[PDB]
Amino acid sequence: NNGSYPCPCCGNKTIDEPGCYEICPICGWEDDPVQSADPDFSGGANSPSLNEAKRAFNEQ
Ligand SMILES: [Fe+2]
Ligand code: NA
Ligand code: NA
Ligand code: NA
């Protein structure tokens, strides 16, 4: 669905409240506040870090 905040990974506005573990229906990123705080931290709610996930999404 449309939301009001950008997904940290894909940038599409699918998020209602940042840092509340919403899962993006476009790219699959789970909005874990740890992983937006540290974009190089792997193994949070998502296996990839945010930076890893961003690159993976873009290369599709
Ligand atoms: Fe996304
Ligand atoms: Na984007
Ligand atoms: Na930060
Ligand atoms: Na890492």
PDB file of N, CA and C in Angstrom, residues 7-42:
ATOM      1  N   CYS A   7      10.463   3.786   2.379  1.00  0.00           N
ATOM      2  CA  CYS A   7      11.155   2.575   2.764  1.00  0.00           C
ATOM      3  C   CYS A   7      12.659   2.852   2.764  1.00  0.00           C
ATOM      4  N   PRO A   8      13.378   2.516   3.829  1.00  0.00           N
ATOM      5  CA  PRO A   8      14.822   2.755   3.851  1.00  0.00           C
ATOM      6  C   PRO A   8      15.566   2.089   2.699  1.00  0.00           C
ATOM      7  N   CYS A   9      15.075   0.940   2.225  1.00  0.00           N
ATOM      8  CA  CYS A   9      15.754   0.180   1.185  1.00  0.00           C
ATOM      9  C   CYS A   9      15.413   0.702  -0.201  1.00  0.00           C
ATOM     10  N   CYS A  10      14.152   0.619  -0.609  1.00  0.00           N
ATOM     11  CA  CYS A  10      13.790   0.910  -1.994  1.00  0.00           C
ATOM     12  C   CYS A  10      13.395   2.369  -2.225  1.00  0.00           C
ATOM     13  N   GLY A  11      13.118   3.138  -1.171  1.00  0.00           N
ATOM     14  CA  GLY A  11      12.758   4.523  -1.285  1.00  0.00           C
ATOM     15  C   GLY A  11      11.327   4.807  -1.617  1.00  0.00           C
ATOM     16  N   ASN A  12      10.531   3.806  -1.932  1.00  0.00           N
ATOM     17  CA  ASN A  12       9.116   4.038  -2.178  1.00  0.00           C
ATOM     18  C   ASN A  12       8.391   4.248  -0.855  1.00  0.00           C
ATOM     19  N   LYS A  13       7.384   5.124  -0.862  1.00  0.00           N
ATOM     20  CA  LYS A  13       6.691   5.474   0.385  1.00  0.00           C
ATOM     21  C   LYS A  13       5.651   4.419   0.715  1.00  0.00           C
ATOM     22  N   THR A  14       6.098   3.386   1.457  1.00  0.00           N
ATOM     23  CA  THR A  14       5.276   2.295   1.917  1.00  0.00           C
ATOM     24  C   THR A  14       5.168   2.235   3.438  1.00  0.00           C
ATOM     25  N   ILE A  15       5.767   3.166   4.163  1.00  0.00           N
ATOM     26  CA  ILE A  15       5.864   3.095   5.614  1.00  0.00           C
ATOM     27  C   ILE A  15       4.928   4.078   6.275  1.00  0.00           C
ATOM     28  N   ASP A  16       4.216   3.611   7.298  1.00  0.00           N
ATOM     29  CA  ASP A  16       3.311   4.466   8.081  1.00  0.00           C
ATOM     30  C   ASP A  16       4.000   5.156   9.241  1.00  0.00           C
ATOM     31  N   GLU A  17       4.959   4.511   9.889  1.00  0.00           N
ATOM     32  CA  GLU A  17       5.632   5.067  11.053  1.00  0.00           C
ATOM     33  C   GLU A  17       7.050   4.515  11.061  1.00  0.00           C
ATOM     34  N   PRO A  18       8.084   5.326  10.836  1.00  0.00           N
ATOM     35  CA  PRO A  18       9.429   4.756  10.776  1.00  0.00           C
ATOM     36  C   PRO A  18       9.865   4.062  12.042  1.00  0.00           C
ATOM     37  N   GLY A  19      10.584   2.982  11.846  1.00  0.00           N
ATOM     38  CA  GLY A  19      11.176   2.232  12.922  1.00  0.00           C
ATOM     39  C   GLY A  19      10.252   1.286  13.633  1.00  0.00           C
ATOM     40  N   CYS A  20       9.150   0.876  12.983  1.00  0.00           N
ATOM     41  CA  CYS A  20       8.129   0.061  13.600  1.00  0.00           C
ATOM     42  C   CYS A  20       7.986  -1.303  12.935  1.00  0.00           C
ATOM     43  N   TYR A  21       9.025  -1.773  12.227  1.00  0.00           N
ATOM     44  CA  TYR A  21       9.097  -3.151  11.778  1.00  0.00           C
ATOM     45  C   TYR A  21       8.074  -3.473  10.704  1.00  0.00           C
ATOM     46  N   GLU A  22       7.529  -2.461  10.038  1.00  0.00           N
ATOM     47  CA  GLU A  22       6.697  -2.725   8.870  1.00  0.00           C
ATOM     48  C   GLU A  22       7.553  -3.393   7.798  1.00  0.00           C
ATOM     49  N   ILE A  23       6.979  -4.332   7.067  1.00  0.00           N
ATOM     50  CA  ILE A  23       7.685  -5.047   6.007  1.00  0.00           C
ATOM     51  C   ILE A  23       7.265  -4.469   4.672  1.00  0.00           C
ATOM     52  N   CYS A  24       8.205  -4.069   3.858  1.00  0.00           N
ATOM     53  CA  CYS A  24       7.874  -3.394   2.617  1.00  0.00           C
ATOM     54  C   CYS A  24       7.318  -4.394   1.623  1.00  0.00           C
ATOM     55  N   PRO A  25       6.141  -4.151   1.071  1.00  0.00           N
ATOM     56  CA  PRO A  25       5.573  -5.083   0.079  1.00  0.00           C
ATOM     57  C   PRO A  25       6.281  -5.027  -1.265  1.00  0.00           C
ATOM     58  N   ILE A  26       7.047  -3.976  -1.533  1.00  0.00           N
ATOM     59  CA  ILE A  26       7.770  -3.838  -2.787  1.00  0.00           C
ATOM     60  C   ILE A  26       9.074  -4.612  -2.755  1.00  0.00           C
ATOM     61  N   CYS A  27       9.897  -4.385  -1.725  1.00  0.00           N
ATOM     62  CA  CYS A  27      11.271  -4.912  -1.720  1.00  0.00           C
ATOM     63  C   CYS A  27      11.537  -5.899  -0.602  1.00  0.00           C
ATOM     64  N   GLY A  28      10.626  -6.087   0.346  1.00  0.00           N
ATOM     65  CA  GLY A  28      10.816  -7.039   1.428  1.00  0.00           C
ATOM     66  C   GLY A  28      11.568  -6.513   2.633  1.00  0.00           C
ATOM     67  N   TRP A  29      12.088  -5.303   2.606  1.00  0.00           N
ATOM     68  CA  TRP A  29      12.844  -4.797   3.743  1.00  0.00           C
ATOM     69  C   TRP A  29      11.941  -4.639   4.961  1.00  0.00           C
ATOM     70  N   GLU A  30      12.367  -5.196   6.087  1.00  0.00           N
ATOM     71  CA  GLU A  30      11.675  -5.042   7.359  1.00  0.00           C
ATOM     72  C   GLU A  30      12.263  -3.817   8.060  1.00  0.00           C
ATOM     73  N   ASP A  31      11.410  -2.868   8.432  1.00  0.00           N
ATOM     74  CA  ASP A  31      11.877  -1.581   8.928  1.00  0.00           C
ATOM     75  C   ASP A  31      12.324  -1.651  10.391  1.00  0.00           C
ATOM     76  N   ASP A  32      13.459  -2.310  10.586  1.00  0.00           N
ATOM     77  CA  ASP A  32      14.122  -2.485  11.864  1.00  0.00           C
ATOM     78  C   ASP A  32      14.905  -1.211  12.155  1.00  0.00           C
ATOM     79  N   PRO A  33      14.590  -0.501  13.252  1.00  0.00           N
ATOM     80  CA  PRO A  33      15.311   0.752  13.539  1.00  0.00           C
ATOM     81  C   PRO A  33      16.801   0.559  13.740  1.00  0.00           C
ATOM     82  N   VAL A  34      17.258  -0.609  14.156  1.00  0.00           N
ATOM     83  CA  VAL A  34      18.699  -0.840  14.293  1.00  0.00           C
ATOM     84  C   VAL A  34      19.409  -0.692  12.963  1.00  0.00           C
ATOM     85  N   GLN A  35      18.779  -1.217  11.914  1.00  0.00           N
ATOM     86  CA  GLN A  35      19.404  -1.316  10.622  1.00  0.00           C
ATOM     87  C   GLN A  35      19.296  -0.034   9.804  1.00  0.00           C
ATOM     88  N   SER A  36      18.321   0.830  10.100  1.00  0.00           N
ATOM     89  CA  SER A  36      18.369   2.172   9.562  1.00  0.00           C
ATOM     90  C   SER A  36      19.345   3.058  10.339  1.00  0.00           C
ATOM     91  N   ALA A  37      19.501   2.817  11.638  1.00  0.00           N
ATOM     92  CA  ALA A  37      20.476   3.565  12.429  1.00  0.00           C
ATOM     93  C   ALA A  37      21.906   3.244  11.995  1.00  0.00           C
ATOM     94  N   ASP A  38      22.200   1.975  11.780  1.00  0.00           N
ATOM     95  CA  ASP A  38      23.510   1.537  11.312  1.00  0.00           C
ATOM     96  C   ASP A  38      23.294   0.792  10.010  1.00  0.00           C
ATOM     97  N   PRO A  39      23.495   1.458   8.861  1.00  0.00           N
ATOM     98  CA  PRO A  39      23.198   0.836   7.567  1.00  0.00           C
ATOM     99  C   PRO A  39      24.168  -0.253   7.176  1.00  0.00           C
ATOM    100  N   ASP A  40      25.242  -0.453   7.947  1.00  0.00           N
ATOM    101  CA  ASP A  40      26.170  -1.530   7.716  1.00  0.00           C
ATOM    102  C   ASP A  40      25.975  -2.715   8.654  1.00  0.00           C
ATOM    103  N   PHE A  41      24.968  -2.681   9.524  1.00  0.00           N
ATOM    104  CA  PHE A  41      24.736  -3.757  10.479  1.00  0.00           C
ATOM    105  C   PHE A  41      23.892  -4.851   9.834  1.00  0.00           C
ATOM    106  N   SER A  42      24.493  -6.010   9.611  1.00  0.00           N
ATOM    107  CA  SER A  42      23.830  -7.166   9.025  1.00  0.00           C
ATOM    108  C   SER A  42      23.248  -8.025  10.141  1.00  0.00           C
TER     109      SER A  42
END
